[PDB]
Design a protein around this ligand. Structure first.
Ligand SMILES: CC/C(=C(/c1ccc(O)cc1)c1ccc(OCCNC)cc1)c1ccccc1
Ligand SMILES: CC/C(=C(/c1ccc(O)cc1)c1ccc(OCCNC)cc1)c1ccccc1
Ligand SMILES: CC/C(=C(/c1ccc(O)cc1)c1ccc(OCCNC)cc1)c1ccccc1
Ligand SMILES: CC/C(=C(/c1ccc(O)cc1)c1ccc(OCCNC)cc1)c1ccccc1
Ligand SMILES: CC/C(=C(\c1ccc(O)cc1)c1ccc(OCCNC)cc1)c1ccccc1
Ligand SMILES: CC/C(=C(\c1ccc(O)cc1)c1ccc(OCCNC)cc1)c1ccccc1
Ligand SMILES: CC/C(=C(\c1ccc(O)cc1)c1ccc(OCCNC)cc1)c1ccccc1
Ligand SMILES: CC/C(=C(\c1ccc(O)cc1)c1ccc(OCCNC)cc1)c1ccccc1
Ligand SMILES: CCCCCCCCCC(=O)N(CCO)C[C@@H](O)[C@@H](O)[C@@H](O)[C@@H](O)CO
Ligand SMILES: CCCCCCCCCC(=O)N(CCO)C[C@@H](O)[C@@H](O)[C@@H](O)[C@@H](O)CO
Ligand SMILES: CCCCCCCCCC(=O)N(CCO)C[C@@H](O)[C@@H](O)[C@@H](O)[C@@H](O)CO
Ligand SMILES: CCCCCCCCCC(=O)N(CCO)C[C@@H](O)[C@@H](O)[C@@H](O)[C@@H](O)CO
Ligand code: NA
Ligand code: NA
Ligand code: NA
Lengths: 271, 271, 271, 271
């Protein structure tokens, strides 16, 4: 069909992307103005209608995309499903979920990420970098769980606001890890009752700050190489060898070329 | 002309650079002494005249440079325009701009950076490294904007000093990100009214600290390679291949040399 | 023997690993529920019996492993000795050691690390990375010891809570290093009595934060390469050349191939 | 001479190094015990004599080294001059310097670094890494000086404890940079009088934390490669090409080998 063809040409254009980006910024700005409690009844009603206009433009946009690519074709992309959910969640007459309320209309600004390709690639790098740090994130989870059970048993009876239960302990252990008032606010007061409390919190700080930094460095380094390798694949179209694989087999590739040079020289000297 | 030639020879000399560097340090030191409110009327007038002398030396310096290189030639360098603005801004009888006042004469010490070539190269590395982190900086901007709108709507009515409006929220979210009294000062008090506030601030901390570190690591790594590659171009004069490009095509260059070795060996065995 | 053979086949299976992992999570969860002081007598007795069941399953598991591999074969692995100690420590009718009490049954959750191979490899990377940072860790130890002796002599008489003895000084120096209330809580108050105290604490902060970061970066970078090289050895089975050795001899390997190319070209031109 | 020869053989032995290391630890431990104000007159006199014994052993050690290597030969090493000063400074009957007092006998423990070769190499890596970060350290110095002059002029009259003079401003700007109570303790109070103070402190934090991290990453990366390259030179004895030089010329070395392969193949096909 010619109708689905020219609609895709329109959707894939730079101006269409710019119009949709402009509407996201406009929706974002109206939601920001609506945080102002002093605004008049007319000013609020006006901005709410501008929010309604922005929302309807997105319904036209998504419906135009579903028709032009097909239900299966549109939903083949994770970015499209995200775009679909962000907009479709607004058209909901009552929902039965384990969430508070959908008053967070501002999450629509997250579409700037999906609509801008350079920003889409950054998040892509970060998400693809997550599986590779799963074991470190799990190790940190185990350290926190063990630590929380210990802290609850040791300090909960004497310090109930900070360690009274497992939930309170997880919260103040996260605070200790971020180094936030860990000594003047938590451990110096706890040491006044339990003088050897530093045997618990100092190794806890040393271990968690090292593991967290490991988790962050792991993500930053992979995400940086993934984003870079994706660009070399979104230019040449050829598959890019992962930098780690190049580095692992570098020595192997060097001795093979060395040995092939000597045997070629061995046959060259005697002809 | 012989006048413009010998003036360039003088300007490009090591001693001329040292004289101008000495005057910048002297101007910087007099402005530092002038922060002392206890000083006598004579001492203040004296230092203000030494500041005036330093300023006039810079007017001679820039005018000497404009004549020796030509208006177009001088203004071709961004460092020269910066040097021009820093000095020309002082000779201003009233200005109509969206700024407070030009009492910040101390910004003249920033000329140490433009006048010292090693320091000029460091800032150059840092500035050239900025475009490459634009998408991460934009992602962090979007996270802050979404977060500020949420925090204003959720906590502004109960916590007006910290979240009363969009501006107050952006400020305390920047504080939370820097881990400054985030729990003892902000979130433990907010949890006394909103017990699930940690569902907001803990993921906000996790996401922003990771993104900020990504932004900083990105800048530090590029700036380091740019400064290094600039030096290999300011020695040999030959263009230096970016380290990333060397790394991306390393595997490709290795299999090409491997394949050329085997085909050469294939023709060598049968002659 | 056929009995020891089929028992090893069972132990090395994926389902056996999953059953033992399930029991660790179950034991971990019951120990977490037991931190709740409000629980009834029946609820506590019940969970204590579920803890007892979990413990006995581990005694069956280890005994099954000792028989199937032999005492020497089982104890050949450091992970097995760790698994043995974690379980065998529970079956102890009074012990004479320089420890408080074995109420930390929650340390049994650390078995998730030894039982899950990806998690076992992460800790392995981290432990093997420790010898290489021993000199930096020793340098930081020497800085802390010298600093503590100084701080005790200088500030102990005027500030006994923070510097009264060597132990109190080591503790507040660790706090200063983590940047926790170092100025508003410790150094601004100390400067009210000793105005040049900043000559001590600012260089102490500068030196220790740099050394700690060196210690952490050192561990993170090695552990990352060790874990990666271990995987290339737990796939191909061939020994992986350490990335540092590849990098050190890279220039050497390149000039050797360059020189062999020119001499081959020298003999090729004249035949 | 045979006397100077066998004395060098003794000095260069492992046991001699161990004896001197034992005496440093012993001296360090006695100085630590002497921080205890509760000690009796006899206990103090005893430890002071053990300190005196340790000091005399070092005088024998250095004098033995000066004779065995010669005045010029001994003083040729920077580590020896350091060892000489640390010991010779103790034998001083009154000194006229811009220092407080030589009560810091504990600085003798810094000899553990010079006496242990692995620890000596770590400090060597760190010291040799300093010239390369001189421009970044200078940039950070200029930012602090400009910032201190601004802060004194803007906030000194309203906030004299924190910004009353140039010295007070440098101190609280260093505190702000370390993120220590920067908002709850300094900027929220300053904003109550100067509402746009965040325009000053937020860009100051952003710029200084980035520059400091640049300074630290710069030192850690060079020191790590220097220590590594020094070891490859203290094993093979051959000069090690700096990793940066290997990386810069990697692309250049690859295209030269590529071009030499094609021209060799061009002559091989037609013989
Ligand atoms: C720190 C980055 C790094 C890595 C590397 C080391 C040896 C190789 O053969 C290939 C890659 C590296 C890079 C990324 C890694 O994973 C990131 C997320 N997993 C934690 C793991 C290792 C490295 C380490 C030392 C020298 C050169 C590169
Ligand atoms: C962390 C530096 C790094 C990089 C790299 C990875 C693969 C390549 O083919 C070329 C460069 C790298 C270096 C700088 C980068 O950009 C810095 C600013 N953008 C966020 C992005 C990636 C890297 C990652 C893993 C192993 C070796 C180098
Ligand atoms: C930061 C990692 C690194 C390293 C390197 C530098 C030169 C070499 O010939 C081989 C390895 C490196 C990697 C890990 C090191 O040890 C980690 C634990 N010891 C402190 C030490 C150095 C490096 C530094 C500069 C460029 C490329 C890699
Ligand atoms: C971060 C280390 C690094 C570096 C590098 C980049 C390109 C080269 O041709 C040679 C070395 C590097 C390593 C150390 C440097 O100096 C450390 C102290 N000066 C600030 C500067 C740059 C680098 C950056 C990107 C990819 C691979 C290595
Ligand atoms: C090259 C991109 C990449 C990886 C990479 C990124 C930066 C580096 O400096 C080195 C390796 C990568 C990241 C993590 C990996 O394993 C982590 C261990 N698994 C638990 C394996 C490969 C990768 C490869 C396949 C899938 C996802 C990421
Ligand atoms: C080699 C200098 C360089 C870059 C570089 C610096 C250090 C590395 O370890 C790897 C790459 C660089 C930096 C960032 C780049 O892309 C970031 C993604 N764009 C949003 C691409 C290249 C660069 C190249 C062209 C223009 C500006 C910087
Ligand atoms: C390759 C794994 C490895 C090392 C390594 C990891 C990551 C890198 O980027 C560069 C080197 C390593 C780590 C530390 C080493 O020496 C530190 C100085 N000794 C005090 C020597 C080698 C190693 C080698 C042998 C035993 C243990 C670790
Ligand atoms: C290889 C050791 C080295 C350097 C190095 C260390 C680690 C790397 O990843 C890349 C380079 C080094 C460090 C800093 C350099 O320049 C910084 C800019 N000068 C202001 C130049 C070279 C060096 C070289 C000569 C003297 C001192 C240090
Ligand atoms: C750098 C490595 C960390 C140094 C280790 C710190 C030593 C802890 C010793 C210590 O401070 N206490 C003495 C235990 O008897 C416990 C506390 O009671 C004490 O700090 C009081 O101030 C409260
Ligand atoms: C490491 C991952 C972070 C751990 C997650 C923390 C759990 C938060 C649970 C919790 O603390 N609350 C119970 C919610 O019912 C909310 C607060 O009310 C409570 O902290 C009070 O102390 C105030
Ligand atoms: C960035 C590099 C660090 C800057 C260095 C800070 C200068 C310290 C000078 C100074 O503040 N004092 C004056 C010494 O005479 C000591 C204190 O007494 C003073 O701070 C009072 O506020 C208390
Ligand atoms: C993440 C980027 C940083 C966000 C920028 C923060 C906006 C600052 C706006 C603001 O807070 N003020 C309004 C200026 O009119 C100044 C202060 O007066 C105010 O914070 C009061 O709470 C005191
Ligand atoms: Na901090
Ligand atoms: Na704090
Ligand atoms: Na803090």
């Amino acid at each position: 069909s010619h109708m689905s063809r020219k609609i895709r040409d329109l959707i894939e254009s730079k101006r269409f992307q710019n119009v949709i980006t402009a509407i996201i910024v406009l929706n974002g700005a109206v939601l920001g103005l609506l945080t102002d409690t002093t605004l008049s009844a007319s000013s609020q009603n006006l901005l709410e209608r501008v929010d309604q206009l922005c929302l309807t433009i997105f319904i036209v946009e998504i419906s135009l995309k579903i028709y032009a690519y097909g239900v299966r074709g549109f939903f083949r992309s994770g970015w499209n499903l995200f775009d679909f959910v962000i907009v479709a969640i607004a058209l909901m007459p009552a929902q039965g979920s384990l969430s508070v309320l959908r008053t967070f209309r501002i999450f629509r600004v997250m579409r700037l990420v999906s609509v801008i390709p350079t920003m889409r690639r950054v998040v892509q790098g970060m998400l693809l970098a997550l599986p590779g740090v799963g074991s470190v994130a799990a190790l940190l989870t185990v350290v926190f769980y063990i630590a929380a059970v210990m802290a609850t048993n040791l300090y909960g009876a004497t310090f109930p606001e900070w360690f009274g239960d497992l939930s309170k302990s997880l919260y103040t252990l996260f605070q200790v890890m971020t180094l936030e008032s860990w000594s003047m606010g938590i451990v110096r007061p706890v040491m006044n009752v339990h003088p050897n409390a530093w045997v618990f919190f100092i190794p806890f700080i040393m271990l968690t700050t090292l593991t967290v930094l490991n988790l962050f460095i792991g993500i930053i380094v992979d995400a940086m190489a993934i984003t870079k390798e994706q660009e070399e694949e979104a230019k040449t179209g050829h598959h890019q060898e992962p930098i780690s694989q190049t580095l692992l087999h570098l020595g192997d590739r060097l001795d093979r070329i060395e040995k092939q040079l000597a045997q070629n020289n061995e046959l060259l000297q005697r002809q």
